[PDB]
Symmetry: C3
Subunit: 149 residues, 3 copies
């Protein structure tokens, strides 16, 4: 009894992990996940940057970060409106870093941006052009999370 | 050994439960669930009110109910077409009650409605412009379920 | 007590099985699955037929197969563009079969199709007015999977 049931439950658990993995694959597929590509998702809600990070973090993802023109357009198409990117110069003014760490490689700044305008701008938004503009982290923009390829 | 295997398996189960909960959160987010708000969703299928209640119940949700103008708009954008709301005046004519209990607070009736037209109309549908019209519960309208915030 | 913990583990597993089943039902509902009808899903990615089969197979579904006009319209609405169908005449030229078995019955060929054009065409794509054309299995078309009613 005991040992047999325990061995069976281990098989039940492994079967459940396999099924859940399959469910996640199907959901990613229905969400637009392209083979071997990272995918972006949004609930179309606009909120302050701190809430986007908290939200993507709960979902075990990160605030969307374009690493090249392709991904930049991908995020643009997903958001449809202005959306925060996982990039800020909160730590050292003028030095934009990825929220995931490290200095910005690819960038697509609008002319004369980032400019830390007025009272200050430490966050970044991809606008309805794919271009970038630094804006107040307190402002509310579309939440777009990123998940691994 | 047995007590050890059992302990390790309970750990695996706790991890799997959290992982499934994450799947549910990501899915709701991808379908438009806003922070702190109820999740509204539809399969675009039109059916009699009885079937809508049965369908949402089977999913552990309930027929969508607008508690205010904001929710009414959210349901409107999910349905696109005429859809049943979880409200009826089956007990006392003219007294609309939520199928989950309690008297109707917010309402968005169309002009000249409710009119308990013809042989009688005890169900409610959100239609054009998001306004309401009472209709026969036997009529087929889009199924929209709601899940807790 | 070992046996008490084992009994709890069984209940935890069964509870998990029930919740995962619910998660699958809510996802199918959100993807447009109609009561008693199979449903269709796409990530909008274009790829050769062999890749579509592999992808859908891995998700425990199959390349979409229209069995009547309703399903054909449904697949057309989901795909938005040209997509492979689970129909080919690879096994015996001229005789189309479903990838899951059986000779083609219902069909919606464009005029003058199928024509096994050029060096040959053994796969099938649903194109413009939801009409069908046989095409090379090597060409890349939208991946659309179908899942059981
Ligand atoms: O204060 C925000 C923003 O203002 C200026 O840019 C404008 C805005 O991005 C927005 O309203 O759209 C305008 C174009 O339609 C754009 O000029 C700049 O001062 C910018 O640096 C600043 O972040
Ligand atoms: O008896 C049903 C319903 O009929 C009338 O409303 C019409 C219907 O909702 C539907 O056909 O769309 C029409 C607008 O295009 C609308 O007028 C009303 O008599 C209504 O009270 C009644 O419930
Ligand atoms: O060899 C491909 C295909 O070519 C011809 O049809 C064309 C294609 O179906 C597609 O590109 O759309 C065109 C119209 O928009 C159409 O002419 C046919 O020879 C066809 O049988 C063949 O499979
Ligand atoms: Ca600063
Ligand atoms: Ca700054
Ligand atoms: Ca700026
Ligand atoms: Ca009545
Ligand atoms: Ca009535
Ligand atoms: Ca009426
Ligand atoms: Ca052939
Ligand atoms: Ca020929
Ligand atoms: Ca052929
Ligand atoms: Ca052809
Ligand atoms: Cl700021
Ligand atoms: Cl009625
Ligand atoms: Cl071929």
């Amino acid at each position: 009894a005991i040992e047999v049931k325990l061995a069976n439950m281990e098989a039940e658990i492994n079967t459940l992990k396999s099924k859940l993995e399959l469910t996640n694959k199907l959901h990613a597929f229905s969400m637009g996940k392209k083979s071997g590509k990272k995918f972006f998702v949004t609930n179309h809600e606009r909120m302050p940057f701190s809430k986007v990070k908290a939200l993507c973090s709960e979902l075990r993802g990160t605030v969307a970060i374009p690493r090249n023109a392709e991904e930049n357009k991908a995020i643009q198409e997903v958001a449809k409106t202005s959306a925060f990117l996982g990039i800020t110069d909160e730590v050292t003014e003028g030095q934009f870093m990825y929220v995931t760490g490290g200095r910005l490689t690819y960038s697509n700044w609008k002319k004369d941006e980032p400019n830390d305008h007025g009272s200050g701008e430490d966050c970044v938004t991809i606008v309805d052009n794919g271009l970038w503009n630094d804006i107040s982290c307190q402002a509310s923009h579309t939440a777009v999370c990123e998940f691994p390829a």
